[PDB]
């Protein structure tokens, strides 16, 4: 009878809210900030850890740590702080009266999911829980039942093909190139113009620059020729303390690492070749249905040139007699949460929750038999 909770815990953003809602109520950066300087004035309330937007608003005196790196949780006390801020401070609800739905990247370690279930059932003890694949939730929010999903966020870019509600786990392909790698590459290439960013507070500034000013070029070499010829692609950004920086080709050299990973020295292929290899790893008779239903999700797929570039690259890779369609909804930044809210509100989902007595009888192993 109670309302379930949907909490997408991504590598860079935590999106939590109630099932049945259209948009998540709490979208906050998953960071933990700790003071790196000395406190000299007594009386003022100084906490040992700042979580969420409070870490963002005070980041000039804080070291910021991400509890999740490449979809894998590394710090568990910081992850508990993120979950406590999500439940008690943002959603303002008691977790013991609400089932919680959580998301997880494919090809993740088992101990991550086991410790997630242990924390959900022993520290924030819920009546029930479930762990779902993010690309299945993206396909749920897309409204269709078939297609291949490229979900790229802050740590993980994964392609999962699903045909008529049936997933193909041998064709699920995961690449560890996402928005944090693009932010680091933008930091590396911003030193060519004389702008130096080294701190974790400056990481958020470079990430804001990447969110506001970067775009995907349709043709890379033509865009470098255009940038070298005239200064028409140069854009200006205002730093928080007063300086104005100007960037040229670095607007489109940063997300080009999504298509050319050798910019950061990785042997893997681009996201278009990842999608094509995931499609050709499937059975033949479904491949056409995977060609016309390329579903994009995640914030990293929110550059305003990525759909046409993906369409062009897959059309160059696929045979010319096949129709290529890239599904890029405007709400695809939060589509994992929207699909989780759709899934948790279904009447055919209520018997597939992992309840507390099943956890007590099974221990940290039920989540590998009731979830994928």
Ligand X SMILES: Nc1ncnc2c1ncn2[C@@H]1O[C@H](COP(=O)(O)OP(=O)(O)O)[C@@H](O)[C@H]1O
Q: Residue 179 interacts with Mg ion (CB under 5 A)?
A: no
Query: Which of 116-124, 187-195, 328-336, 354-362 is the region at the interface with its own copies (rule: CB under 8 A)?
Result: 187-195
For the bound state, the minimum distance from the C-beta of residue 18 to its own copies, rounded and expressed in Å, comes to: 20
For the bound state, the minimum distance from the C-beta of residue 354 to ligand X, rounded and expressed in Å, comes to: 23
Q: Which is nearer to its own copies, 3 or 199 (CB)?
A: 199
Report the run of H or E that residue 361 belongs to, with start and end. Answer: helix 356-362
For the bound state, the minimum distance from the C-beta of residue 178 to Mg ion, rounded and expressed in Å, comes to: 9
Q: Which is nearer to its own copies, 94 or 239 (CB)?
A: 239
The SS3 assignment for 226 reads helix
Q: Which is nearer to Mg ion, 184 or 289 (CB)?
A: 184
Mask for 144-173, x = binds its own copies (CB under 8 A): -x----------------xxxxxxxxxx--
Beta-bridge mates of residue 18:
5
242 binds, among its own copies, Mg ion, ligand X, none (CB under 5 to 8 A by kind): its own copies
For the bound state, the minimum distance from the C-beta of residue 125 to its own copies, rounded and expressed in Å, comes to: 25
Q: Residue 261 interacts with Mg ion (CB under 5 A)?
A: no
Query: Which of 56-64, 139-147, 207-215, 281-289 is the region at the interface with ligand X (rule: CB under 6 A)?
Result: 207-215
Residue in 12, 17, 52, 153 binding Mg ion, rule: CB under 5 A = 153
Query: Angle 76-84/110-122 helices, nearest 10 degrees?
Result: 50
Mask for 179-198, x = binds ligand X (CB under 6 A): xx------------------
Q: Residue 12 interacts with ligand X (CB under 6 A)?
A: yes
Rounded Cα distance, 302 and 311, in Å: 15
List all residues 6 or more positions away from 316 whose beta carbon is below 8 Å from its beta carbon. Answer: none
Query: Which of 31-39, 117-125, 206-214, 271-279 is the region at the interface with ligand X (rule: CB under 6 A)?
Result: 206-214
The SS3 assignment for 34 reads strand
Q: Residue 10 interacts with Mg ion (CB under 5 A)?
A: yes
CA 55 to chain centre: 20
The DSSP output letter for 79 is: H
Query: Angle 306-317/271-280 helices, nearest 10 degrees?
Result: 50
Site for ligand X in 148-167 (CB under 6 A): 153-154
The DSSP output letter for 284 is: G
Q: Which is nearer to its own copies, 95 or 223 (CB)?
A: 223
User: For residue 302, which of 173, 153, 185 has the smallest C-alpha distance?
Assistant: 153
Q: Residue 330 interacts with its own copies (CB under 8 A)?
A: no
The DSSP output letter for 67 is: S
Do 252 and 220 meet the contact criterion of CB atoms below 8 Å apart?
Answer: yes
Q: Residue 312 interacts with its own copies (CB under 8 A)?
A: no
User: For residue 329, which of 138, 178, 180 has the smallest C-alpha distance?
Assistant: 138
Could you list the beta-strand ranges (E) of 19-143: 26-29, 32-35, 50-51, 62-65, 68-69, 72-73, 100-104, 128-133
Site for its own copies in 11-30 (CB under 8 A): none
Rounded Cα distance, 328 and 338, in Å: 15
Rounded Cα distance, 305 and 260, in Å: 15
For the bound state, the minimum distance from the C-beta of residue 111 to its own copies, rounded and expressed in Å, comes to: 7
Q: Residue 299 interacts with ligand X (CB under 6 A)?
A: yes
Residue in 3, 49, 226, 268 binding its own copies, rule: CB under 8 A = 268
Q: Residue 339 interacts with ligand X (CB under 6 A)?
A: no
Residue in 92, 231, 243, 357 binding its own copies, rule: CB under 8 A = 243
For the bound state, the minimum distance from the C-beta of residue 172 to Mg ion, rounded and expressed in Å, comes to: 15
Q: Residue 58 interacts with its own copies (CB under 8 A)?
A: yes
The SS3 assignment for 260 reads coil
Q: Residue 369 interacts with its own copies (CB under 8 A)?
A: no
- State the sign of the Cα–Cα–Cα–Cα dihedral 211, 213, 218, 221: negative
Q: Residue 236 interacts with its own copies (CB under 8 A)?
A: no
Q: Residue 67 interacts with ligand X (CB under 6 A)?
A: no
Site for its own copies in 99-118 (CB under 8 A): 107-111
Instruction: List, edge to edge, every strand of the sheet that includes 128-133.
Output: 26-29, 13-18, 5-9, 100-104, 128-133, 354-355
């Amino acid at each position: 009878e109670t309302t379930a909770l949907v909490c997408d815990n991504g590598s860079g953003l935590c999106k939590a809210g109630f099932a049945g809602d259209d948009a998540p109520r709490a979208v906050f950066p998953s960071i933990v900030g700790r003071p790196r300087h000395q406190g000299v004035m007594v009386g003022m309330g100084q906490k040992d850890s700042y979580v969420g937007d409070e870490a963002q608003s005070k980041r000039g005196i804080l070291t910021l740590k991400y509890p999740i790196e490449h979809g894998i949780i590394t710090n568990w006390d910081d992850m508990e702080k993120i979950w406590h801020h999500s439940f008690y401070n943002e959603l303002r609800v008691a977790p013991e009266e609400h089932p919680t739905l959580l998301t997880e990247a494919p090809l993740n370690p088992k101990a991550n999911r086991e410790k997630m279930t242990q924390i959900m059932f022993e520290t924030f003890n819920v009546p029930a829980m479930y762990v779902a694949i993010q690309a299945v939730l993206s396909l749920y929010a897309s409204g269709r039942t078939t297609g291949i999903v490229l979900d790229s966020g802050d740590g993980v870019t994964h392609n999962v093909p699903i045909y008529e509600g049936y997933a193909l786990p041998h064709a699920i392909m995961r690449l560890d190139l996402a928005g944090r790698d693009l932010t680091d590459y933008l930091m590396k290439i911003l030193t060519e113009r004389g702008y130096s960013f080294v701190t974790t507070a400056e990481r958020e500034i470079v990430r804001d620059i990447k969110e506001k000013l970067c775009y995907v070029a349709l043709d890379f070499e033509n865009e470098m020729a255009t940038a070298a010829s005239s200064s028409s692609l140069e854009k200006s950004y205002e730093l928080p303390d007063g300086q104005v920086i100007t960037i040229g080709n670095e607007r489109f050299r940063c997300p080009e690492t999504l298509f050319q990973p050798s910019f950061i020295g990785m042997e893997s292929a681009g996201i278009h070749e990842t999608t094509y290899n995931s499609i050709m790893k499937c059975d033949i008779d479904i491949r056409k249905d995977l060609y016309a239903n390329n579903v994009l999700s995640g914030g990293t797929t929110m550059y305003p040139g990525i759909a046409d570039r993906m369409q062009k690259e897959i059309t160059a890779l696929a045979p010319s007699t096949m129709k290529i369609k890239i599904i890029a909804p405007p709400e695809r930044k939060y589509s994992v949460w929207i699909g989780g809210s759709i899934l948790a509100s279904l009447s055919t989902f209520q018997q597939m929750w992992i309840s507390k007595p099943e956890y007590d009888e099974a221990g940290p192993s039920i989540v590998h038999r009731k979830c994928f």
